Design a protein around this ligand. Structure first.
Ligand SMILES: CC(C)CCC[C@@H](C)CCC[C@@H](C)CCC[C@H](C)CC(=O)SCCNC(=O)CCNC(=O)[C@@H](O)C(C)(C)COP(=O)(O)OP(=O)(O)OC[C@H]1O[C@@H](n2cnc3c(N)ncnc32)[C@H](O)[C@@H]1OP(=O)(O)O
Ligand SMILES: CC(C)CCC[C@@H](C)CCC[C@@H](C)CCC[C@H](C)CC(=O)SCCNC(=O)CCNC(=O)[C@@H](O)C(C)(C)COP(=O)(O)OP(=O)(O)OC[C@H]1O[C@@H](n2cnc3c(N)ncnc32)[C@H](O)[C@@H]1OP(=O)(O)O
Lengths: 586, 586
């Protein structure tokens, strides 16, 4: 988080995404804000001018002037509220418009061709992508708009008040006040250097105190078996004393530093301000400004004095806004990292995953109802080769059974099957990403109606395009014997958190009902049909055979060996067996 | 977190712990703070009185009066800084003294007779005890002192300024201003009711947006196998629109509410203030106050006007302090819950652990070198009986081997052995908590020197009491062949995080070196000697036999069966076997 030319360039790009045109609504809010910033400055100076006239009326014991200027203030009261609150409304809307624009751009780039998947399970340059896509966008939009507003308001205030004081007091007044404020700020900043060192030391000691307590907790049983209460007490007490003595020293230093700070920045500023403003008055022979009535002297003094105070407050605010620029730089850096990674992924380039050409080798061809592995060395994307050259085919209507110990390498095969990981040479055949399925032990369950659950990848209008009437959907439910669920929550339209409402067996049955509804070419059964009866398994397998859906199974059960022709076996050290059938066993 | 009489009573007790005497240092800081609060109020009113005299000197074009009162301000400048910063220093010290007193009391009650162990592994009324013992104490002390200061400063300011205005303007002025401020506050609070409802709705929608994104992350592989990019995009976009439309409505309402707030509380307050202060002036026949010079009229007006402003600011601050009282109540409730549980544990009473008399049944006798289970039905403290009546003895010099599948019930036996869990009937014999040992797979390793590691439950002065010279300690290291570690980090005094510096085998060897150094009566070997050679195991077992230390083993290895007389076997359903020896196997 350091401000350079790269920082500004990166802001320019991000803002270009956030301001696409010149006649959008963001430009409308920007001009609205600029107009209200100028109006707000004028309203503030008018209040300064009118307040002294009300007070001169009161002091002069004149009811005419008091009432005249009080009514001027009352009649102008609503306009000031509009000018201030319309500014706030414009700023809030600009933040919200910025958020919507950035989120649309990020998510359009994000939900495209496994990029959401690759971001976490194929790269490591960003963790917790959801946090960065949601929280950082809001924070960045808020920070950029807050910086704009907080640098645009003080700037105008300082310009106007310096211009007016150049005439009321002369160029010497504002210059001397600003010179003192700058010098005092530098001097106090130099004096306040140690606070940072003491602050980090305090945080370190508090961290040590927390860590020691946590250790005493996690190892409470072993300590309890010992009679070590009189020892852990000594250790924690010693750590507490270490922290406490530092706190004394930090408090004493803060007291000493505060004393000088109050004297220099709080009261000598008042003395300098009195000296600066008093020049036109105490100079009885001042050229032209002040040879006037008492009321004129009263008004001129208090107008000038209040202008100096508000000018100095503006200097403080602009300093604060400059400090907030650092946070803006931090948010921009994170967002720029995100945008870079999306650009890398969307073009296939990836780096730092969690040797042949890692970023894709060989070729992939497109065909239907045919899968052909031809010298494809499936491997982890890190480059670690899982196995030697592998070759096998599943031509049509053929079932393959995966057997062996805990695989840890078959997942790689399944991921390359659905383009999830790059190819590593040879030539391979696949359909167009829509003909492959994979149901884990607990299939994916969405939030919404049961019709959404069974029509997951498609919308209702998509179903109408296919013409699948709800009766056929019920038949698919009937085949898996899930038709009774329709009455559980009052029809299809019922919306519930289906992730936990259904039991395991129900989830797998609906998942295969979804498989039935889709009628794809290939599917993977990653040992999911574990909470269902044998009869239903054979019943669904019979449908799969009759329909023509090729199926991959990982059951390993003897009956499933009888129901499958091919088989794959791995020893955990690198090997694979592929043949027609086994007479009795491997 | 609701204020009642119980809340105040609980504060009284906690503060009684925090203020033990009447002549301590806390009472010194309290009187110091009270004196500085009064001085700070007087200094503020003096500045109000002197500022108008400086300004009347400037306006009067009188260098004599300007210089006179400016020098009065300069000469009194250091005293005001002392009065303000000595108040801040006193408040900080009172917070720190409060923290030290409370922490000492809590930890004295906490580290006593397994109470640290029971708090987390025998009850459930508090989780994360370290967080409550460390963070809540600091926050509570800060909150109580902040409430005291922020209710004591505005109170004095309001009293002084109302008293002075009762004479400057009359009782009508302060009364009318306070009446308007109260009425406006009530009216605006009534108008601002919906903001809370909209705020919670906004937080709910943001939570939904975060949850949906997280779901898209955790289920990215299954979605990827599908071509569902065009569906999760629709779901997330719909959720974003739901949030965004609410944000529009919330922004528009905030704009509308702000407009009324500015008009009523920001400017009509100024109009009412002008009307209130102007009464003595515009009344040309005012009885006595104002029949005076222009400078007197100038000074009287601005003194009164500034007093009204600071009185009203004090009303705002006291309102804020009252709001902070709610947080104080929350912290007190948590601390009172902690104190109650420590009191329950320290007397043996416990509730809600994670049927016979759960809180202790039977009796425990004290003896050395003898352990006698007599009809003790060991069970979980929840009351669920693990096994039926159990009886066996380990008289002297006898070794017992535990065998079977994953136990899950032997841990209960070991915990009752070291008084960690209550007895459930019968009569049992144990030594005085100092003769039992238990080394897990990874023994406990402290932060400190190696001498601390081997002398864990004892201090260096304790070792000098026993007279164990460092040569004998080295011999204990030599027996376990850990003498070479002395040169690894430059002698005993080297301090390092021994939790991870040592490898497993080294940790167990030092743990048994600690066992050797202590020479207790009974010890438990929870399958820890797994990363050590067979020769060293026999070598250490020979020492244990020769020394006379009875030993319990959980190895299950055949050679260890040969080296152990008794044995315990559990089937996981409730049973135990205890006999002299086994000819070949169970
Ligand atoms: C219009 C044209 C023709 C020309 C002008 C055009 C402009 C645009 C050109 C110039 C623009 C400049 C101004 C920009 C500034 C920003 C820059 C870039 C960045 C920085 O910044 S530089 C970087 C490194 N440098 C630092 O980093 C330390 C500097 N740091 C600070 O500048 C602040 O951080 C502090 C905290 C020090 C100042 O802020 P602050 O302390 O709050 O101001 P303060 O002095 O308290 O108020 C004023 C006081 O006038 C007194 N007073 C007068 N009259 C009366 C009266 N009649 N009655 C009672 N009192 C009176 C009274 O004492 C009142 O104060 P009081 O009544 O409240 O006690
Ligand atoms: C000494 C003895 C003899 C007798 C007195 C003894 C005392 C101790 C007895 C009385 C103590 C009472 C006072 C205690 C109070 C606390 C109570 C218990 C709790 C509450 O509280 S009740 C609970 C339910 N009730 C609410 O919950 C809504 C109530 N909520 C509020 O009370 C605040 O929350 C707000 C925000 C509304 C008020 O605070 P605030 O708005 O900040 O005050 P504000 O009106 O702005 O300042 C004053 C304005 O005088 C104007 N002004 C005058 N003269 C001039 C001039 N020459 N030039 C320019 N302007 C002038 C100017 O307009 C200035 O203001 P400005 O120049 O800045 O615009």
């Amino acid at each position: 988080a350091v401000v350079d030319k790269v920082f500004f360039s990166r802001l320019i790009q991000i803002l270009k995404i956030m301001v696409p045109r010149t006649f959008c609504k963001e430009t409308g809010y920007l001009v609205l804000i600029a107009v209200m910033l100028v109006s707000r400055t004028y309203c503030d100076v008018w209040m300064i001018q009118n307040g002294t006239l009300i007070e001169s009326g009161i002091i002069g014991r004149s009811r005419k002037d008091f009432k005249r200027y009080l009514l001027n203030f009352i009649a102008a009261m609503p306009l000031i509220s509009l000018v201030n609150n319309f500014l706030k409304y414009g700023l809030n809307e600009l933040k919200l418009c910025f958020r919507v624009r950035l989120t649309k751009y990020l998510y359009e780039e994000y939900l495209q061709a496994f990029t959401y998947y690759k971001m976490g399970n194929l790269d490591n340059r960003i963790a917790n992508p959801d946090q960065l896509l949601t929280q950082d966008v809001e924070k960045f939009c808020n920070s950029v708009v807050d910086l704009y507003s907080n640098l645009s308001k003080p700037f105008l205030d300082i310009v106007l008040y310096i211009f007016k004081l150049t005439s009321a007091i002369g160029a010497q007044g504002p210059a001397s006040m600003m010179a003192y404020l700058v010098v005092s700020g530098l001097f106090l900043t130099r004096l306040r250097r140690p606070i940072g060192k003491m602050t980090i030391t305090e945080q370190k000691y508090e961290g040590e105190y927390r860590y020691v307590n946590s250790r005493l907790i996690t190892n409470s049983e072993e300590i309890a078996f010992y009679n070590g209460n009189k020892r852990e007490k000594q250790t924690v007490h010693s750590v507490f004393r270490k922290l406490v003595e530092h706190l004394h020293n930090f408090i004493l230093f803060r007291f000493s530093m505060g004393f000088i700070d109050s004297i220099i920045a709080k009261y000598l500023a008042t003395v300098v301000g009195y000296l600066v403003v008093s020049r036109p008055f105490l100079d009885l022979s001042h050229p032209r400004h002040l040879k006037s009535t008492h009321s004129e002297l009263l008004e001129d003094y208090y107008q000038s004095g209040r202008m100096l105070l508000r000018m100095s407050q503006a200097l403080g605010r602009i300093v604060l806004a400059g400090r907030e620029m650092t946070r803006l730089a931090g948010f921009t850096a994170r967002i720029t990292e995100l945008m870079q990674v999306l650009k890398d992924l969307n073009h296939g380039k990836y780096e730092r995953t969690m040797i042949p050409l890692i970023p894709g080798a060989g070729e992939i061809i497109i065909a239907d109802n045919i899968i052909k592995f031809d010298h494809v060395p499936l491997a982890t994307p890190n480059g670690d080769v899982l196995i030697r050259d592998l070759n096998f085919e599943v031509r049509s209507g053929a079932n393959v059974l995966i057997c062996g110990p805990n695989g840890c390498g078959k997942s790689s095969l399944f991921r390359v099957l659905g383009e999830l990981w790059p190819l590593f040479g040879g030539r391979l055949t696949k359909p167009e990403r829509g003909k492959l399925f994979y149901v884990p032990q607990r299939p994916y369950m969405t939030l919404g109606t049961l019709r959404d659950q069974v029509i997951y990848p498609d919308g209702r209008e998509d179903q109408k395009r296919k013409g699948i009437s709800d009766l056929v959907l019920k038949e698919y439910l009937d085949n898996v014997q899930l038709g009774h669920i329709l009455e559980r929550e009052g029809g299809w339209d019922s919306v519930q958190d289906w992730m936990d409402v259904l039991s395991g067996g129900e989830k797998q049955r609906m998942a295969m009902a979804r498989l039935f509804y889709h009628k794809p070419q290939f599917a993977i059964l990653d040992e999911c049909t574990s909470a269902v009866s044998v009869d239903v398994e054979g019943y669904i397998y019979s449908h799969c055979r009759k329909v023509g859906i090729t199926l991959f199974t990982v059951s390993h059960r003897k009956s499933l060996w009888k129901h499958h022709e091919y088989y794959l076996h791995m020893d955990g050290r690198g090997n694979y067996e592929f043949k027609q059938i086994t007479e009795d066993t491997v």
